[PDB]
Structure formats: structure tokens, C-alpha cells
Amino acid sequence: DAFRKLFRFYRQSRPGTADLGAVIDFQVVRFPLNVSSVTERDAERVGLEPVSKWRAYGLEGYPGFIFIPNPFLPGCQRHWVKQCLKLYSQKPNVCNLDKHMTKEETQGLWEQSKEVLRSKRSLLERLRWVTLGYHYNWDSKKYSADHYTPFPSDLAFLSEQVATACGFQGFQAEAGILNYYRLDSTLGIHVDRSELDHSKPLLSFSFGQSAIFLLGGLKRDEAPTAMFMHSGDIMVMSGFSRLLNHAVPRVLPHPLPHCLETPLPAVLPSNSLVEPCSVEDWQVCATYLRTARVNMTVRQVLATGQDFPLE
Numbered sequence: 514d515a516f517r518k519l520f521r522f523y524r525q526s527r528p529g530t531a532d533l534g535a536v537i538d539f540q541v542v543r544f545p546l547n548v549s550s551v552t553e554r555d556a557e558r559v560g561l562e563p564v565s566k567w568r569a570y571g572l573e574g575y576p577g578f579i580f581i582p583n584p585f586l587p588g589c590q591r592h593w594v595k596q597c598l599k600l601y602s603q604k605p606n607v608c609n610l611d612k613h614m615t616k617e618e619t620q621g622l623w624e625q626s627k628e629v630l631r632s633k634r635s636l637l638e639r640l641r642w643v644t645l646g647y648h649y650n651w652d653s654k655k656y657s658a659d660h661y662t663p664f665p666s667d668l669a670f671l672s673e674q675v676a677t678a679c680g681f682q683g684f685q686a687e688a689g690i691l692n693y694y695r696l697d698s699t700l701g702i703h704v705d706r707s708e709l710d711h712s713k714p715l716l717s718f719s720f721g722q723s724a725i726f727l728l729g730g731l732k733r734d735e736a737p738t739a740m741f742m743h744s745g746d747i748m749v750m751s752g753f754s755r756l757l758n759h760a761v762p763r764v765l766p767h768p769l770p771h772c773l774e775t776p777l778p779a780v781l782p783s784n785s786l787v788e789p790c791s792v793e794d795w796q797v798c799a800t801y802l803r804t805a806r807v808n809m810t811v812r813q814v815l816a817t818g819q820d821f822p823l824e
């Protein structure tokens with residue numbers, strides 16, 4: 514339980530201390546990306562700056578582990594979190610509130626939360642996860658072609674470009690899992706093995722408040738290494754770093770960030786998947802993200818020539 518020992522270590526807040534400086538803000542190497550793999554027009558279309566200005570990092574003993582500090586164009590974060598909270602939750606996809614709350618109670622989430630923010634505990638505070646594409650059955654720990662809703666296009670294009678730049682051009686976005694946090698929310702010690710195609714990488718996107726991650730080998734026995742994950746930061750776990758045990762011990766609060774300080778531009782490209790945000794949407798997103806953090810994992814389920822067995 515060495516991983517759990519560091520998990521309880523950092524779980525003791527201790528902000529701005531020896532603990533704050535024991536992590537790896539952005540052993541450390543730079544990962545040569547491929548500015549040739551993507552064009553600034555598609556990256557503008559999805560709100561990421563030219564790969565020529567991206568910086569990627571890896572660590573010794575963790576090959577294929579890619580950390581990329583915030584590459585998002587200034588302001589783009591706002592759209593992604595918005596669609597994360599305003600759109601991706603409701604009826605077509607699946608969230609945790611579907612188990613004991615009916616679709617009528619959940620459909621009125623955004624507007625009733627706007628009335629709640631205007632009036633000054635609602636459901637958006639109670640959100641814990643959303644699944645996109647092939648809906649992960651938590652109980653079964655399996656995927657199924659039977660439980661499926663179409664993967665959001667813009668999100669898929671994002672994951673596709675990022676995975677292309679990181680060296681996997683044949684990446685179709687099939688499974689999505691968007692974790693939502695409270696301040697005290699955590700993510701447990703686990704490996705990410707529910708998929709059938711392990712070759713394709715796991716694409717994590719951090720937002721909201723800063724958080725502390727961890728990276729340990731396939732055996733939970735191997736002690737973890739700890740690093741930050743600010744808003745906009747992106748982890749691409751590939752090759753070896755895909756069967757590696759990881760967690761999120763804390764959402765560290767404000768000593769909302771600076772990437773949220775910079776707003777959207779009025780002029781966005783005509784083919785851009787980055788989209789406009791009404792003002793009260795960044796109001797509720799801005800408050801909720803002053804409270805806590807969001808995470809966006811994207812995954813390949815099936816290999817290119819593989820399909821779910823029948824039996």
C-alpha cells in the first residue's frame with residue numbers, strides 16, 4: 514500500500530509547504546513532438562496552439578508517459594468545460610444521476626442551476642461522472658456494443674489531433690469518461706485496463722482547480738511519483754504508461770485560475786469546433802470551478818480490425 518501511503522500523505526492537505534514543493538510542476542525530459550503531424554488550422558479549429566509551441570515532458574522509468582502543459586489557445590478552456598457541464602451531461606449520454614433520479618429531474622439541471630446561482634446544493638454540485646461513446650458499465654467493468662451513444666464530434670476531433678501529435682495518428686475516439694470533482698473528491702488507485710485495444714493511448718485533460726496526480730508501475734507496489742495538473746494540462750498515457758496504476762489524491766484549491774482569467778476571442782474560425790459561450794454559462798462554470806475541478810479522459814475501445822466478440 515505504498516501508493517496508498519503517498520495517497521494519504523498528500524491527502525493531508527499541507528498546501529504551500531514541503532508538500533507543495535515535493536511535486537513536479539511544469540528525471541524530467543522533453544518529449545519531441547511532431548509539429549508536422551497537425552496543422553495550425555485544425556488546432557485552431559479545436560483550440561490548441563501550433564504543436565511547434567507545445568512542450569511535452571516524460572520521466573525516467575515511465576516510457577511513453579507524456580505530460581503536455583496547457584497548449585490550449587488562451588480562452589478555449591471556457592468552451593470545453595461549458596460543453597462538459599451544459600451539454601455533455603443531459604439526456605442523450607449517461608451520468609450517475611440516472612440511477613435514482615429520472616430524466617425529468619435531470620433535464621432541468623442547467624436552467625434550475627441558473628436560477629440557483631441567481632438567487633444566491635443543486636444537481637450540478639452532485640455530478641460525479643459522465644460517459645460518452647461506448648458507455649462504461651461500472652458494475653460490470655466491461656464495455657458493450659449494446660450500450661452506445663454517439664461520441665461528441667468536437668471532443669473526438671480534439672482527442673484525434675492530440676493523439677496524432679503524440680505519435681498515434683490512427684486514433685478514433687470511442688470511449689469518453691468525464692470525471693467531475695468536489696474539493697474533497699478523489700480518484701482511486703487503479704490501472705486503466707477495461708479497454709480491448711491497449712496499444713492506443715489514454716488521453717486525460719485537466720481543468721478546474723489544480724490537482725495532484727500520481728504515476729506508478731503496473732504493480733501498485735511500485736512507489737508513485739507525484740505531479741501537478743493545472744487547468745488545460747493534458748496527460749497522454751501511451752505504450753507503457755497505459756497499464757500503470759494512477760490516482761488523483763487531491764484537488765488543491767486557490768491559495769479560479771489564470772487560463773480562466775483570459776476569455777474567448779470574439780472572432781473564432783468559421784470551421785472551428787471551439788464555440789461561443791453565453792455569459793451566465795461562464796458564470797456557473799466560473800463559480801463551480803472556483804469550487805472544484807473537472808477531468809476528461811478519452812479512450813480507444815476496439816482495435817482498428819477488432820470488434821466485440823459475440824459468444
Ligand SMILES: [Fe+2]
Binds near residue numbers: 703704705759
Ligand atoms: Fe485512470
